[PDB]
Amino acid sequence: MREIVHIQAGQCGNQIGAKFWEVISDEHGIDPTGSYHGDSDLQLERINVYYNEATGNKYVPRAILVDLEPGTMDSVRSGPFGQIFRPDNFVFGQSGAGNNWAKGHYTEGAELVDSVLDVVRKESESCDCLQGFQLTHSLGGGTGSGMGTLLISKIREEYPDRIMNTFSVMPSPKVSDTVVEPYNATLSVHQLVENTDETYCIDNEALYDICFRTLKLTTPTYGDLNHLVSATMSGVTTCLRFPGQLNADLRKLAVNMVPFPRLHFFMPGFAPLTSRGSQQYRALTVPELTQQMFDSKNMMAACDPRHGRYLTVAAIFRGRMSMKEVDEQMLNVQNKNSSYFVEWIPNNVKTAVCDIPPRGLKMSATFIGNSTAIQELFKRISEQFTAMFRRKAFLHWYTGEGMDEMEFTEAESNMNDLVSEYQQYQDAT
């Protein structure tokens, strides 16, 4: 069966990843010690996907952790699930990146990529057949932007035929937690156009919006932004792990969802998101999930979807459903929104229906959509970039680590060609 390797780079990466392997564990019914104590027998058939076996009935995730520069080491180890990862996988060095790209890709990345890929190959050959290389990294930072895209330059090189999904947390128009941030996005999108099959554009503002405009949370901590990301991360590989009525791999999505090989920057949604105790004033049905998925205040990429045409979308439904209400709710949205889609594609939406819900819910979904409205996430950075680069503002912390000025103009030429190949299909014809 089909098996996935999960890689975690940048300090944003394992913080999502530590919450990621808690959602996966409770979805399979697996304790902190890896002992299976699940309810049914239906969740052992694809433990093989994420958890390879161990000696006595214990399960270990195939989780490489590149990002444990030692400030994060003894919190992930001294966490809820520090007794579940294999301790040889904790690959790191000393003197972390420093919110620097060139100290992730050229200087400290080159003296660590050999120690990572010696564990990547030891986790590939313990598998029957691989397809998946999930990389949870973030743009903007250090390790997650230079070293996160150094491995994709190497892992795609040693595996030219694997589906490479990178759940890439992106910068924001207002929330600026990094001063150098328009450099670590331009230099990393230049790598993630060439070297990935799909990559999910997630922002913190549209995660800050849902925890206030929809979930009504008083103080959304960083755990409650990762608990929303991870509910999508276990929503793309649901049909891999669980039986269904219309299955969808990580490749039936990434053949349908992508028209042209550069147009693979996705915005993920999730439903049902709502705020309650145990008294909520609604009814979980198939037309109830549909309106919330397509709603412009339940994206995650923090762009306005009604500014552009959706190229094609994928609605990975879960739970027990009826396929007529699935195929007819996906029809009426496409007709009411005839300008909001691309006219010159026959049917835009595809459907994927699994048969096992989450633990507490009755039904759920995942809106993965490829839109031209993500032109706004790349135009804002390319305006912030050429403002900093015109003065040659922060460049002596990068050219003092080995780079050249003629790699900066290479990176802005590539991002400006995505905006050209998004403004085209946003226009009508």
Binding site: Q94, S95, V179, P182, A393, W397
Partner: protein
């Protein structure tokens, strides 16, 4: 493990080192005789973190500190006080005479022949550490050893260590109140090696902290004990991410990447939120939007410097304690709306938030008390250029009259050194006039 080497220089540097190491011993639990009887009750945790404390096998803890002052009078307070047995007994005194307030006795006469003990002691101290280094230098401008001897200590540590980060925390001469008449001569000669070697120079001042100790703290007679604790609270939350467990930690290399646009404009003008009294510890909410708005008014800058007459370039909000990361962005979109808080065109990102969540502790003996959160904003503005023009003017007014200068050139230094230090500060002030002005098309 990441670590720092705290090198205090001068009397200003050692007097601040009385209270920086008084604060560290209380947070981690270390008594004034090296032991840790606090964590022996629980029985776990390595809280005497190896950032600041070497550990020996007998349970005693030794700091990473070395300090040189060329006068026994200052360090004999340390060698007889409460912190006698804590430090290693190589606290380098050996000065048969004080510097006498000049840069020439100083960089040349008696700073040489004592520096041979200094560099070898750092090599005996740096080679016990694996990982990050950073030299926390402590001195003052204007003095003799804080200006002269630091200048010899930088060009001899930018060669034996190369590209290591050097955070030096200088006390700058105030434009209105000066405790020496030759202090405008020393604080222009020390810039010629602060600009070149030390990558990041935190300037604070004595008059701008006098007003903070009178207005906010409501202390009518603030001695030097009560000023050095406020610098100690700042220095703690600069190097707090190297120790404690935060939600967004900022390494000492992450300062260099963010705070410093160009290699010669590294002067970032620290602040704090010290509105504790502690009578006014009640009567006041002190939320995230409250303590972030303390940097708005120019009555809370630590330097006598008006930020409203200049741009900003890059800021670094560093929090402590019970901070939720959502409340921060409410207190930042507010600041980017206010039109007198003025940025440049070429930095649209602005800020950077480091949320450590260990609360700042209280030194018993006054003068503030237990607040639940704090902030140490570090922002290199364009406004520091008018803080230097009120010091080049003090230099130029007594350089035409050729005053005080026979004690500078009659100690080995040439009289041509002064105009070499003027042609930097004239050209370094010229740099701030270009960076703040945007380009039009």
């Amino acid at each position: 493990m990441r670590e720092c080497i705290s090198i205090h220089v001068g009397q200003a540097g050692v007097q601040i080192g009385n209270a920086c190491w008084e604060l560290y011993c209380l947070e981690h639990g270390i008594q004034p005789d090296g032991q840790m009887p606090s964590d022996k009750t629980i029985g776990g945790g390595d809280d005497s973190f190896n950032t600041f404390f070497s550990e020996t096998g007998a349970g005693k803890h030794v700091p990473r500190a070395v300090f040189v002052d060329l006068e026994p009078t200052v360090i004999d307070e340390v060698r007889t006080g409460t912190y006698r047995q804590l430090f290693h007994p190589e606290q380098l005194i050996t000065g048969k005479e004080d510097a006498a307030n000049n840069y020439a006795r100083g960089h040349y006469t008696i700073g040489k022949e004592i520096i041979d003990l200094v560099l070898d002691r750092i090599r005996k101290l740096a080679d016990q550490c694996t990982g990050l280094q950073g030299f926390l230098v402590f001195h003052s401008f204007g003095g003799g050893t804080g200006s002269g001897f630091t200048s010899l200590l930088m060009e001899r540590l930018s060669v034996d260590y190369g590209k290591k980060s050097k955070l030096e925390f200088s006390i700058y001469p105030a434009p209105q109140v000066s405790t020496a008449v030759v202090e405008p001569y020393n604080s222009i000669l020390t810039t010629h090696t602060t600009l070149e070697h030390s990558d990041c120079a935190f300037m604070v001042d004595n008059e701008a902290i006098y007003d903070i100790c009178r207005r906010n703290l409501d202390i009518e007679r603030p001695t030097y004990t009560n000023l050095n604790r406020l610098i100690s609270q700042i220095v703690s939350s600069i190097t707090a991410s190297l120790r404690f467990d935060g939600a967004l930690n900022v390494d000492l290399t992450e300062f260099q990447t963010n705070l410093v646009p160009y290699p010669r404009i590294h002067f970032p003008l620290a602040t704090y939120a010290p509105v504790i009294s502690a009578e006014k510890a009640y009567h006041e909410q002190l939320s995230v939007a409250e303590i972030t708005n303390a940097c708005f008014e120019p009555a809370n800058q630590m330097v006598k410097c008006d930020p409203r007459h200049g741009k900003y370039m890059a800021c670094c909000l560093l929090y402590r304690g019970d901070v939720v990361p959502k409340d921060v962005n409410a207190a930042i979109a507010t600041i980017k709306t206010k039109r007198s808080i003025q940025f440049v065109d070429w930095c649209p990102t602005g800020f950077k938030v480091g949320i450590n969540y260990q609360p700042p502790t209280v030194v018993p003996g006054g003068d503030l008390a237990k607040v639940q959160r704090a902030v140490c904003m570090l922002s290199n503005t364009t406004a520091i250029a008018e803080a230097w023009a009120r010091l080049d003017h003090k230099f130029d007014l007594m350089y035409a009259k050729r005053a005080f200068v026979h004690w500078y050139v009659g100690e080995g230094m040439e009289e041509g050194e002064f105009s070499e230090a003027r042609e930097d500060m004239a050209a370094l002030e010229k740099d701030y006039e270009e960076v703040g002005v945007d380009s039009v098309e």
